[PDB]
Amino acid sequence: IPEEISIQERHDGASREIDRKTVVANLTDAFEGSTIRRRKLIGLSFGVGMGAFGLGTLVAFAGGLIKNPWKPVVPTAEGKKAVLWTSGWTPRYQGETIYLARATGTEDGPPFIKMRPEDMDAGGMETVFPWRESDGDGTTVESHHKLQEIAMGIRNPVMLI
Amino acid sequence: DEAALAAMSNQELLALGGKLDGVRIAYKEPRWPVEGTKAEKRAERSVAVWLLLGGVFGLALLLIFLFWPWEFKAADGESDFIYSLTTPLYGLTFGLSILSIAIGAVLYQKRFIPEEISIQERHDGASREIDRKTVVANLTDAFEGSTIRRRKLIGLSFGVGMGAFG
Amino acid sequence: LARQAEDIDTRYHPSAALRRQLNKVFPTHWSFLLGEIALYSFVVLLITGVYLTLFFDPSMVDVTYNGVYQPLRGVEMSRAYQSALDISFEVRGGLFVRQIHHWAALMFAAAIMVHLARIFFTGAFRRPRETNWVIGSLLLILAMFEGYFGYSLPDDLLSGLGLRAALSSITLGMPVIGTWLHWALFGGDFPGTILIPRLYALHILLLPGIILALIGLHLALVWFQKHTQFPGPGRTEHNVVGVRVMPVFAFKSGAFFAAIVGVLGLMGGLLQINPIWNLGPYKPSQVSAGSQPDFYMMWTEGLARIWPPWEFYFWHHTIPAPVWVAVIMGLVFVLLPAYPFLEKRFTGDYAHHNLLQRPRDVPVRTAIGAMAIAFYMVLTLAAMNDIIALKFHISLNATTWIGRIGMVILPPFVYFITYRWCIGLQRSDRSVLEHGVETGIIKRLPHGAYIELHQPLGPVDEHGHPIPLQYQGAPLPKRMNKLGSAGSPGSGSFLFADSAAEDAALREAGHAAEQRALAALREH
Amino acid sequence: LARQAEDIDTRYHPSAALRRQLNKVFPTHWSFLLGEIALYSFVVLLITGVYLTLFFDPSMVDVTYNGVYQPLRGVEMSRAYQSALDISFEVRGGLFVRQIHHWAALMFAAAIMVHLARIFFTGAFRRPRETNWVIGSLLLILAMFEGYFGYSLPDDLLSGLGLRAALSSITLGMPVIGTWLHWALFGGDFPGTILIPRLYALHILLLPGIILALIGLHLALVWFQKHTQFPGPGRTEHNVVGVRVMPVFAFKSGAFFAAIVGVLGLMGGLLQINPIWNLGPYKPSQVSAGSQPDFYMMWTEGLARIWPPWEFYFWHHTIPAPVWVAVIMGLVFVLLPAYPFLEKRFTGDYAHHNLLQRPRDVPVRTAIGAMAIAFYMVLTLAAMNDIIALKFHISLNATTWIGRIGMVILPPFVYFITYRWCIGLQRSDRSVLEHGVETGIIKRLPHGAYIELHQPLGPVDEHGHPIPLQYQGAPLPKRMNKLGSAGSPGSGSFLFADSAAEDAALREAGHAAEQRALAALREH
Ligand SMILES: CC(C)=CCC/C(C)=C\CC/C(C)=C/CC/C(C)=C/CC/C(C)=C/CC/C(C)=C\CC/C(C)=C\CC/C(C)=C\CC/C(C)=C\CC1=C(C)C(=O)c2ccccc2C1=O
Ligand code: HEM
Numbered sequence A: 001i002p003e004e005i006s007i008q009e010r011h012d013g014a015s016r017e018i019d020r021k022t023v024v025a026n027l028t029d030a031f032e033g034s035t036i037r038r039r040k041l042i043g044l045s046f047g048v049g050m051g052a053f054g055l056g057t058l059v060a061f062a063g064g065l066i067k068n069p070w071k072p073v074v075p076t077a078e079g080k081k082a083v084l085w086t087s088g089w090t091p092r093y094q095g096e097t098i099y100l101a102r103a104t105g106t107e108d109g110p111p112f113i114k115m116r117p118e119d120m121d122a123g124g125m126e127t128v129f130p131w132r133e134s135d136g137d138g139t140t141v142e143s144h145h146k147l148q149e150i151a152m153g154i155r156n157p158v159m160l161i
Numbered sequence B: 001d002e003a004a005l006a007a008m009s010n011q012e013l014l015a016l017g018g019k020l021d022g023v024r025i026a027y028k029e030p031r032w033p034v035e036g037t038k039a040e041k042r043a044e045r046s047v048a049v050w051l052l053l054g055g056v057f058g059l060a061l062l063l064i065f066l067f068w069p070w071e072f073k074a075a076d077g078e079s080d081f082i083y084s085l086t087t088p089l090y091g092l093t094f095g096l097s098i099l100s101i102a103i104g105a106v107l108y109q110k111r112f113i114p115e116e117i118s119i120q121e122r123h124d125g126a127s128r129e130i131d132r133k134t135v136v137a138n139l140t141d142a143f144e145g146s147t148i149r150r151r152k153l154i155g156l157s158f159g160v161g162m163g164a165f166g
Numbered sequence C, D: 001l002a003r004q005a006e007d008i009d010t011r012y013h014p015s016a017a018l019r020r021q022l023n024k025v026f027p028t029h030w031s032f033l034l035g036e037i038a039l040y041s042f043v044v045l046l047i048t049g050v051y052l053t054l055f056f057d058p059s060m061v062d063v064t065y066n067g068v069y070q071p072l073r074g075v076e077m078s079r080a081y082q083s084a085l086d087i088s089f090e091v092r093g094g095l096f097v098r099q100i101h102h103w104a105a106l107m108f109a110a111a112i113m114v115h116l117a118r119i120f121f122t123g124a125f126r127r128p129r130e131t132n133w134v135i136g137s138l139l140l141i142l143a144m145f146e147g148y149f150g151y152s153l154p155d156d157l158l159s160g161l162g163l164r165a166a167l168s169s170i171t172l173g174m175p176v177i178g179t180w181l182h183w184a185l186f187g188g189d190f191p192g193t194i195l196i197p198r199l200y201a202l203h204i205l206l207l208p209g210i211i212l213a214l215i216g217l218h219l220a221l222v223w224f225q226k227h228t229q230f231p232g233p234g235r236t237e238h239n240v241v242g243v244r245v246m247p248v249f250a251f252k253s254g255a256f257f258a259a260i261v262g263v264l265g266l267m268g269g270l271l272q273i274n275p276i277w278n279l280g281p282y283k284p285s286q287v288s289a290g291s292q293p294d295f296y297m298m299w300t301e302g303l304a305r306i307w308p309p310w311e312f313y314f315w316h317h318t319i320p321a322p323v324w325v326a327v328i329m330g331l332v333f334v335l336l337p338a339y340p341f342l343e344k345r346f347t348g349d350y351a352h353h354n355l356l357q358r359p360r361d362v363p364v365r366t367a368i369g370a371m372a373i374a375f376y377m378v379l380t381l382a383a384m385n386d387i388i389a390l391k392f393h394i395s396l397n398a399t400t401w402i403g404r405i406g407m408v409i410l411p412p413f414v415y416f417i418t419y420r421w422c423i424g425l426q427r428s429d430r431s432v433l434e435h436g437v438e439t440g441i442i443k444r445l446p447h448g449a450y451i452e453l454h455q456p457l458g459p460v461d462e463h464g465h466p467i468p469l470q471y472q473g474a475p476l477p478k479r480m481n482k483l484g485s486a487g488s489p490g491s492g493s494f495l496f497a498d499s500a501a502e503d504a505a506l507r508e509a510g511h512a513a514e515q516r517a518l519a520a521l522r523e524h
């Protein structure tokens, strides 16, 4: 393809005064001809009306997402608490037994089994979860749901040293 | 023109712009030639009350959305009837507010903005021969200058390559 | 804001394109807003759909409800149906929003159809605008299929039946490809695991994008090829008579937008549409009695209902009945975009046109359009067989045969009547051109004769009879009161009168301005 | 195609805008393609993402795998992770496509950063173009967050840790709003059921739409405010010297597009990125050692690592440490778009500029930019603490303290060195302007003196010394071979020579054309 050089004649800067004066005259005449400047009541009522409509609409748009983080929804032994203060280690009926179960990685019957103090040496660590024997092994769908919700709780895991 | 484009009034500037664009506005007329009358005040008040209603019921929409019983309560013991009115109220306030605003705007345009007629100077059809000849010369020279017409092997290999890739 | 405006002007210096766009002239006919209706409906659809996407989960995995709606607790359903129920019952203002969405979809379709009717009957598709007609046809097809994919998303019993029958078992029956298309689309046999996510992706991303691009192209073509207009006093094939954008047209357009949004909000708040909770989740073993789609697919359903059972069985193969529906549908969708070229081949007219035609001046095209509309109405009414036969006490087989025969004898009858009606209107126009406008006053003419006191529209001859005018493609007045004949009421408010000076001044200035407008537009 | 071209011309008559766009001149500097790189990366991203949406299912419900990948059979995972595994292992060519997608995202980010560096150092943001700078900054922020939301979609262990830490526990810690934002965004506490569908909707629909609109506006502003250029022989503030679009520029742009697509395909086929199957599904109880986000969030991670633990506890309340990260990141994102106004307030220069600056002529801005780049590099390297301390045998606490101190002492050191280096380059330019170009030849001058045989760039005085030139903002030659001094090899092919006549003719015509180009561009 042949080699070439070209020059473009920018023509930058402000417009020619012709166009500026004509367009500003058009805008000013379209505004002054409507006589809206000397109509105070119409303008102010229009403003308040549009403002109220816009405010109500935006509030209704962004109002379905907002939730209260402190409403008591979690049942405990002293009534109901907010989610951000219960843990799953929280007792439910004033004196229930919560074992320190450990995960086995298999799904025949136990995904969680109890522990004894002798199942660990002086240099060991283990992760444990709250058991609540009323949850049972993972056979039925009900117990399977209970266990899969125990396994996924962001404040449940505990290190045993 | 000149530098003395100033000292020119508004209407000469507007007609100058129009003629530069090809527009020729005929018959521009205000709506109230006589001064303050009672008809003008009545029309202004009528245009204003619609926008007042629109704003009032936008506020009503906000209040209803904030403080109305909305949760599902349906049963046959406690016949709620307050929950069955929760969506109708949203619609009735929202739509009516914005409708009132629209009607106020239409009335304002129909009774205060001046009446006009304009003509636009279509300029349709084929282009002026100047532009057609120049653009076709540009295209033809850009094509013939690359010498691709007398390069058969390059063109055909290019075609087969692009076709296979695609 | 002088400082900001000037600094914008030295940085960008538009000042000439802004002037070129502020002086553009647009014709003002009530019939030129039927496209604005569809545009505003599309905008509302975009907004409400963007809101809805924050709560919808498009999965087909099974769960048990365990929600707030009690008559469905313990029932096993998909995740999409549960998400739709959660939108309906557990988000403050969600039912309102999805009802607005559905009503806006319906208004979108209806406005598109009315706009197409206008474009066809006025003849606005001729030489400079065939491609714009083609783009419009593509937009119509896309809108139909987008609405279909949309209401099939929260899979309940009705949507499931519609999907199954139409999509699965018409794609399954195509002659050679057939099952290959079915398995490429569903990933397997009908109830799969990838159908709803695929429809969701198609519905929120692809088709809206294509529709947005095509709408942009449509409006650009309309902007740069200036609008058409009706013949009239000062109208020619070389000018556009109307109002400039600058003060007026933007104002009218915005007010219309607000009014349409108001109507949609009202009827989305007060009328109920698609109550999915009264239905149940989709299950292949149960069915109900009203299984219709939305009114823009009812013609497809009706065509499937009233088409006779003609199948072909040859060596080791089978061609079922719904193939017929397939080819007829395709033939319609192919005959729609290719009409201007057919008409220009048949009439042999290839000139530029910027003035519209009145539908009464083109009898053959008006008759063709009326025949097509009658066919569409027959197909749409044949889709609500059950409802019609139940509410109005008619046999069901009777309605099937009524549709099957009407499909053949109603279009030609409508054609004949429409042709004769158009020519009758033309003759009624020529009569008021030859004589004057009938006033309705009777005299007795002392030798016992009754005359009726016509009123001429132009000059008169020596003996009082008007000289006949020539037709110019513009409408003519027929009532004496439409011409200023009996007008000028009092100038009170409603119960108290104004002064006499105010009344006289206002009446007199109004008369003067009217006369000046008339005399100005004639002379150009 | 004469008939079709003419009929297009009588229907549309462009013929003048096409000529106005076919003659536009574009400067030709290698540095003006760094934006084309990002544009082409974005196009490839669009295409591959549209392909990917046909197979992805964004749910958070739990399933058991039961697939083809054996070391994960029987493991309970979400539906998104399973869909990603199915894309990877069960669609012919899916792994290739998602690897191309990820590599294209990385190249998008890198090209944007290099383009920003160019724009900043050459000074192309001055009076007519501050708004274009602002639009670019917004595009950068949006690209960062879009990539983040993108790689957090197939929720596995690493993506889950990133989400949890950054999003959940930095939004949770804001002073007053805080938990309200967290619950509005997640619908509840961290592991919810609406997070992944919401991210999916944000990632495929909203942010791509905003980015597309902003890119359109960016390119429009660049098209109508013509490009800048470097000072040179025939360049002024009133003209653009380059090549026309018509034959050349479109060709070069398309070839560059194809080459970038080729590079992306090669490195998406040969290098592996994000092997999600080696990881596992996200579970809140297990973790790994790497952590690490993609390289455009590493500075955020590093800032969180090396910021000291300063918290405030007052009455019944707590202000944690990550608040600091929040305000520092906001301060950076606010200081980026507001730079041109700061510089024009501080230097007091408000004139139009169309000629660029060499980075060596503006020492203070170059030093500021080098300091900012050094800060960014320190923050990015402080994010791979574990990898550095493991591969290169260094203590971990040592790397933490090295970063914590470098964050304060490296930027000023870099500033000082960059200032002195810029002034040194200026002096080296002035020396070759005063004298000639050093040739490197030595003579002995019979009375035992050594001279070095400079070569003048302009006229000479009576006694052979060149008269000093004036600096004009353009680069100067430093090597004698860059000027034609030793050139003209043989004219064979590689192993067999051509005739002497051919060699002489080609050499002589080439010399003539070079001289004519030079003499033509001078004279204008
Ligand atoms: C047809 C239909 C009705 C039949 C019915 C069929 C059926 C029944 C109905 C629908 C059924 C379903 C299955 C249909 C499937 C549809 C499916 C969803 C298809 C999707 C479509 C497709 C595959 C999407 C992917 C492709 C697409 C995303 C890529 C397009 C690229 C995009 C849009 C462009 C973006 C960039 C753009 C803004 C800039 C353009 C480039 C610009 C103009 C030039 C560049 C440029 C400029 C501008 C400079 O100023 C400049 C200055 C100095 C130096 C350099 C440059 C420079 O390079
Ligand atoms: C453009 C033309 C469109 C049409 C004709 C259309 C039509 C529909 C209809 C009729 C429904 C049924 C709603 C119900 O019965 O509750 C629906 C659902 C839905 N639409 Fe659209 N829609 C359109 C555009 C969009 C867009 C652009 C989006 C998102 C960006 C969207 C998002 C949705 C979603 C998420 C649903 C399912 C939510 C639900 O069913 O409650 N739609 N669509």
Ligand code: HEM
Residues within 6 Å of the ligand: C205, D042, D045, D046, D048, D049, D050, D052, D053, D056, D084, D087, D098, D099, D101, D102, D105, D108, D143, D146, D147, D150, D151, D152, D153, D154, D203, D204, D208, D211, D274
């Ligand atoms: C525009 C800038 C974009 C960026 C920076 C980006 C970035 C990313 C990244 C890094 C991933 C992770 C992929 C993986 O690790 O396998 C991803 C996933 C994904 N992207 Fe994008 N993307 C962009 C645009 C798009 C678009 C426009 C679409 C669709 C139209 C899309 C569709 C998807 C989908 C469906 C996924 C999930 C599929 C999967 O993870 O395998 N992306 N994105």
Ligand SMILES: COc1ccn2nc(C)c(C(=O)NCc3ccc(N4CCC(c5ccc(OC(F)(F)F)cc5)CC4)cc3)c2c1
Residues within 6 Å of the ligand: C148, C158, C159, C161, C162, C163, C165, C166, C167, C170, C171, C174, C291, C292, C293, C297, C300, C301, C304, C326
């Ligand atoms: C809700 O309750 C009910 C109860 C009963 N009915 N009965 C019907 C008919 C419906 C109903 O909704 N109809 C609307 C409808 C009709 C056809 C399609 N197809 C697209 C796919 C298919 C196809 C065929 C051939 C193809 O080949 C080629 F690739 F195009 F070449 C491609 C696609 C063609 C038909 C889609 C929606 C309904 C609803």
Ligand SMILES: COc1ccn2nc(C)c(C(=O)NCc3ccc(N4CCC(c5ccc(OC(F)(F)F)cc5)CC4)cc3)c2c1
Residues within 6 Å of the ligand: D148, D158, D159, D161, D162, D163, D165, D166, D167, D170, D171, D174, D181, D291, D292, D293, D297, D300, D301, D304, D326
């Ligand atoms: C992948 O593996 C790993 C392993 C370990 N790490 N460690 C880190 C830090 C990451 C990581 O991904 N960092 C990137 C990152 C950082 C911060 C945010 N925020 C968004 C929300 C947040 C916010 C705060 C206040 C707000 O208030 C207001 F709304 F603005 F008003 C709003 C939003 C602001 C910052 C988002 C991404 C990572 C990844």
